[PDB]
Symmetry: D2
Subunit: 288 residues, 4 copies
């Protein structure tokens, strides 16, 4: 795993997944140089997709990409048995990897997380991206735990790290001997300087070419040029979290006239104050 992997939105139309818009979105991202696509993660609205829709979206992404970039299937759950069914499906349907979130809400212990991901890792042969986002899940996947997992299971391959405490990123790089992927667009630059190898990205849905450029300069070690793009995208990056992801990214795509449509409850339209702000940021970049 290296470079930019947009966490793609799931577009909706007439209350159903918009499979055609999906294809068009995927092809857009591929023309602009992304290394891969993460299907049905948080930005894909996994919580509000039926079991059956989650499967059809993954299959659609696998079928459209048709090997041109890595397809990473969202397969996390806070129920271990479900995380297994999903991971096995991702392998069977032809995904190249699995993104597996730490169980949210039920708050397992570190031993719980170890056991949980261990089952997941044993269930499939695919590379697994562990996904840590304490601010949403109420649990922090500790580096020592990842080190144990990584040393037991060769397919445990990377961490998408969205803990904003970057000394966790140092511990992972130093002790854990795992690939770190940024889980926060705005921390991608400093995480890559730390040893990080890429990013699973929200904003790359909107500006894939520029984000790909930025990340490529950061990987090459050209931070002067990376910073230039970072600072240019900086207001857009802030606007991506002006309300909870994916409310902003879908709003922005609608404003640009790209496929996205409605958010599913309990997610809902941005405030007007917030819209105008995003509106202005998009205008400043000449995106609309």
């Amino acid at each position: 795993f290296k470079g930019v992997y947009p966490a793609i939105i799931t577009p909706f139309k007439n209350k159903e997944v918009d499979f055609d818009g999906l294809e068009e979105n995927i092809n857009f991202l591929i023309e602009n140089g992304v290394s891969g696509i993460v299907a049905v993660g948080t930005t894909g609205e996994s919580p509000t997709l039926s079991h059956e829709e989650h499967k059809k979206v993954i299959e659609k992404v696998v079928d459209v990409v048709n090997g041109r970039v890595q397809v990473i299937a969202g397969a996390g759950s806070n129920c271990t048995e479900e995380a297994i069914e999903l991971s096995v499906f991702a392998e069977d349907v032809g995904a190249d990897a699995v993104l597996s979130i730490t169980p949210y809400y039920n708050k397992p212990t570190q031993e719980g997380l170890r056991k949980h991901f261990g089952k997941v890792a044993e269930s499939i042969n695919l590379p697994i991206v562990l996904y840590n986002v304490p601010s949403r899940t109420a649990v922090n996947l500790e580096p020592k735990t990842v080190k144990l997992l990584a040393e037991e299971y060769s397919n445990i391959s990377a961490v998408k790290e969205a803990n904003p405490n970057l000394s966790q990123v140092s511990e992972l790089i130093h002790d854990a001997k795992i690939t770190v992927l940024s889980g926060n667009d705005e921390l991608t630059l400093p995480i890559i300087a730390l040893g990080g190898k890429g990013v699973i990205s929200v904003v790359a849905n909107i500006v894939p070419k520029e984000f790909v450029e930025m990340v490529n300069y950061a990987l090459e070690g050209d931070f002067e040029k990376a910073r230039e793009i970072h600072y240019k995208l900086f207001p857009l990056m802030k606007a991506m979290f002006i309300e909870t992801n994916p409310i902003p990214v879908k709003t922005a795509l609608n404003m640009m006239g790209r496929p996205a449509g409605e958010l599913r409850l309990p997610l809902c339209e941005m405030s007007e104050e917030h819209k105008k702000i995003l509106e202005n940021v998009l205008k400043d970049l000449g995106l609309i």
Copy 2:
């Protein structure tokens, strides 16, 4: 809503729900004076129950209780369509009310929270208990949002408040359109002192009788007698969070030889260290 409402565990035996054990537990609680039972909440491991088991547990609680005390059924979800469907089922199956958790993990705005709970309120005629636990969900249901909800829908009746900042409870009581139930055993006494009317409780699975008396003292305004049971049980209350609920409560029940059985992954067995502490707490109380 008034008094002690144990949030019951879901006992397991041979990877299946222990229906006889459930029945044994319910009658134990009823016989010790609880006002009602909360089925398949987070203490009942709802995250790791199948859709089928969820419905079967609630049906069994309804049928065993047989109108004797209130049955409040867990029916929340971070997907609104799923919340509506669970709530409809609880009504159709004969439950007296619905416990509805704020969407966890996807972090809806206050407006999205209001829309989510509105859809739930509109789907059923049963009284609804809203459930706020920011330390698990990563979202705080604000008192002004409860106020707007209780104003719009007459079946929005109570809030199980587990926010540990008791100014939020004072604000709920002040902006007075709902009954406040303690969502934390150890804060039950000060929450009733503030004007709370009961508790949805973990510890009441273990010491139903004593907790019922404490609460009744607090409700009567006799805090000297209430404090005396609070303090007797204080070490027990702490041990109930020595690891993530329901790990300790199930552990404790197994210890006492009562129906409980295993935890489902990613929840797992307590530390040897932590069990020793729990064991000793239990022993000092003559429960083992």
Copy 3:
């Protein structure tokens, strides 16, 4: 220690301590039922008094009170040498107790705190009220450290507890080593329910009579009547922290035409937005 001790403001006039206003304020609070006076704490702007103003304000409080009620002198500092000096001064000048805050900013360890408070307790024969407020000091004085202090030093007699996690208060009460005084006006009712014996108060500066009545109702165990006043005063109690104390309380006292005067930098006049909220709260109470 029992009942209501206002932490009095230090009024200023023409850039100097307003000793007459001070006298007038003290007399007003005594006439309206307070149990004592806390001089030159945080609410009295101790960080912005010179060393000589600090000693003078305390001397004046001692002199005006003239033994009528207990005088508790702010002493204490994040430098142990200064804390001893301040404490020995309080004794020499005729105060009845000392209020001693945990060192702020320099973050000593629990062992550091024990040694700091030990040196203070050895330096004087007066009773000492420990002051814990992690939200300001960046340090939490653990109940086990209090237990240890109280066991070694018989003049460590109380803790002013401003940690809003009321489990910490339950722990302090369970050890029964020490009197608990509320450090937060709005948590006074629930803290007394838990076994607290009173409050070091901000809002008592504004409504001494009403707050004294609330607190006595609570100490007698009449929570029905305690609740009535707590809810009557709730919007005021919130207004008291709408910005950092003592900016609201001095603002309210000036609006009321009582001695208070200017705030010393870095504290400064409240926002116009916050002034409007406070003024309406004072008007609702008939205080302006």
Copy 4:
């Protein structure tokens, strides 16, 4: 401007008194090793536990010993505005090159209170001023909007030592401020420079000045492959520097290495036996013994 590595020097004590000879010897050690400047009597220097007179004499000793070879930044912050002015005026009068000025701690002023506070400091002197933000100690966060107003009004508001570990605060400063950002966290120094910061005010540069200077110069020149190598080699040491509250670990470490430090002043006190051993092993691993 401010650039490169500025250690926040300890104040060494001998027999309950500031150890001036030890202080001199520490200063020359750091200068020998290529530091850009010295930060005197900040938190690492136990500013809370020094007398007024010790504070003054310590800054005086630092100015004199340094003798213009490197920049001297004098800690002169207080949570009392009148005292912050006084300390600042003194730093200028005595010959320091710059003032470090911490957001008032404990009393929790509002943003506007902070602006007015730093405004009075800035009006009091002509020295460049480094604003120090460290919410984990002060209970307050100086917002980039507030820094931007300061810098727009006062030409001598020159840098921020940023110890807030939320690094998008750092990119908000780089993006909006026009102030120099200095790292306030040894372990975040490398990612802060990547974001465009220009150096660090450092605890660990007291122990390994030559290594830190060179890691920083690599990160400054944009050679992150080599910055990373030194960052990870020092990573256990950087964590040890906060194993207990700074400056407990750094002084414990200097004493272990037989360099001037001596005792901590209450309420600071000796490290636990368990923490001592962890520190010792990391010192042993780097061969600092």
